[PDB]
């Protein structure tokens, strides 16, 4: 359940996307599967992603709701159901403001937390700002709101949240509608405080939530804002003081100290946030309290490359480390971002370029919550 209000900020750096194209399950001819294109680490959020089949666009492509990581960079999963055959070739095309031309990537065949993420993007001339809100318990999304969608309601995105009655959905719809109007104002006062033109597109990002240990007791609370992918104002760990980044955010900080906004958030993050996280963990215990250990294997392909795989694991937190002769090798190694399979599980792999013949000197180390002991892989 969300915080009841969005306090007004008050009047007074681009990153290119990382692209991964992959199937949900290991590719098998004649077997139904899912083709994924995962884009992450990009800013701003406006992005155009196509899935290509034999040199043309696949028609029915869905994508996840816009969310972002701790560093404020966005991520999206584009996916479609498909049956790969022997001759068909697939790829993903991504267009972004950071790219001079669209990039094509071919398909080479027990702690807990509750998090709410908000993104507001101004569209000068092309309508009102785009507002997207998502709610997470750990790495499982359970609610969403899109200002461009037809329902104009907060919608369920996990089976266990559908239980909640109309008073829940009406209340979350009411709150998220007000948050949209608040950030529409916020974009205006930020444009004014920074003396920016009315024709430019800008982004307000908001994130808050609480962490609990394996005993379901409060650990940490968060509440931070960002303007155009840069820190604006953030609530410190004590949940009593604010960190302002510049003169514009200092004005917001003084208005929030005078209004005692931190005290409102502290009670929510230590009380309501914890209370409903436990209710969600209980109601969706079959999904949220599971742990899927990574199914691991090793791939080999003057020099040779060693690739350490980890598949179908939950939660997404994982560590893959390379080392030669028991010495952590943080050089000549490729580590991709953890990616969603689309079925609730996650994937990751680690690469290392080894001189041919010295392959058995390298070892891949896998740390995950579902593993009783950390694993060691070696060819």
């Amino acid at each position: 359940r969300m915080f009841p209000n969005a306090p007004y900020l008050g009047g007074g750096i681009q990153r290119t996307p990382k692209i991964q194209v992959y199937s949900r399950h290991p590719a098998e001819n004649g077997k139904s599967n899912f083709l994924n294109c995962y884009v992450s680490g990009f800013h701003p959020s406006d992005i155009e992603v196509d899935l290509l089949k034999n040199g043309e666009r696949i028609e029915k492509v869905e994508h996840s709701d816009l969310s972002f990581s701790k560093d404020w960079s966005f991520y999206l999963l584009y996916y479609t159901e498909f049956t790969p055959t022997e001759k068909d070739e697939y790829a993903c095309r991504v267009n972004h403001v950071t790219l001079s031309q669209p990039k094509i990537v071919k398909w080479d065949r027990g702690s807990h937390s509750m998090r709410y993420f908000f993104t507001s993007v101004s569209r000068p001339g092309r309508g009102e700002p785009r507002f997207i809100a998502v709610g997470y318990v750990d790495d499982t999304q359970f609610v969403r709101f899109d200002s461009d969608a037809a329902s104009q309601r907060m919608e369920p995105r996990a089976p266990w949240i559908e239980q909640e009655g109309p008073e829940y959905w009406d209340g979350e719809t009411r709150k998220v509608k007000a948050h949209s109007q608040t950030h529409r104002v916020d974009l205006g006062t930020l444009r004014g405080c920074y003396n920016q033109s009315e024709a430019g597109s800008h982004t307000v990002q908001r994130m808050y939530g609480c962490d609990v240990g394996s005993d379901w007791r409060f650990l940490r609370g968060y509440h931070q804002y960002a303007y155009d992918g840069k820190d604006y104002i953030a609530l410190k760990e004590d949940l009593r003081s604010w960190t302002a980044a510049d003169m514009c955010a200092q004005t917001t900080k003084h208005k929030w100290e005078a209004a005692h906004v931190a005290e409102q958030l502290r009670a929510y993050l230590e009380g309501t946030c914890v209370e409903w996280l436990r209710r969600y963990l209980e109601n969706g215990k079959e999904t949220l309290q599971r742990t899927d250990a990574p199914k691991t294997h090793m791939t080999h392909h003057h020099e040779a490359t060693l690739r350490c795989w980890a598949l179908s694991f939950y939660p997404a937190e994982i560590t893959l480390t390379w080392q030669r002769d028991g010495e952590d090798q943080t050089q000549d190694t490729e580590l991709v971002e953890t990616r969603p399979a689309g079925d609730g599980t996650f994937q990751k792999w680690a690469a290392v370029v080894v001189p041919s013949g010295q392959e058995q000197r390298y070892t891949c180390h896998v740390q995950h919550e579902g593993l009783p002991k950390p694993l060691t892989l070696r060819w």
Partner: nanobody, 113 residues
Framework: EVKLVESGGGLVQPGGSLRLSCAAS????????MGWYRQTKQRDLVAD???????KYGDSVKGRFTISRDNTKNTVYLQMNSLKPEDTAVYYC??????????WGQGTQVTVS
């Protein structure tokens, strides 16, 4: 391997119209989707069409621009009606092979007074 010959650009008054054409040289089995992007750093989708005739348009040109194809000559056409000053850009023809290799033309300047 593949060459894209572009033509039909130039200067036009507001409200006027132009027709771009793009011809792919090589085998007819070498190119599926053909279309246009236009320069803004990035280049934005204008319109493209598959060999089977599946079209897609950028939001800023929907209703005014129309792409068509003569599959018997591997050549596409872009009828750009109701042109505005904001339509001024270099328009790059492009094509996709059936293995998802992209080919790009040098582009044609379009200027709307």
């Amino acid at each position: 391997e593949v060459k894209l010959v572009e033509s039909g650009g130039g200067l036009v008054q507001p409200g006027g119209s132009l027709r771009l054409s793009c011809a792919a040289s090589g085998s007819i089995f070498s190119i599926n989707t053909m279309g246009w992007y236009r320069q803004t750093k990035q280049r934005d989708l204008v319109a493209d069409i598959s060999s089977g005739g599946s079209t897609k348009y950028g939001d800023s040109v929907k209703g005014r621009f129309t792409i068509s194809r003569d599959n018997t000559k591997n050549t596409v056409y872009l009828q750009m009606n109701s042109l505005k000053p904001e339509d001024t850009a270099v328009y790059y023809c492009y094509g996709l092979s059936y293995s998802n290799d992209d080919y790009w033309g040098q582009g044609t300047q379009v200027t709307v007074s």
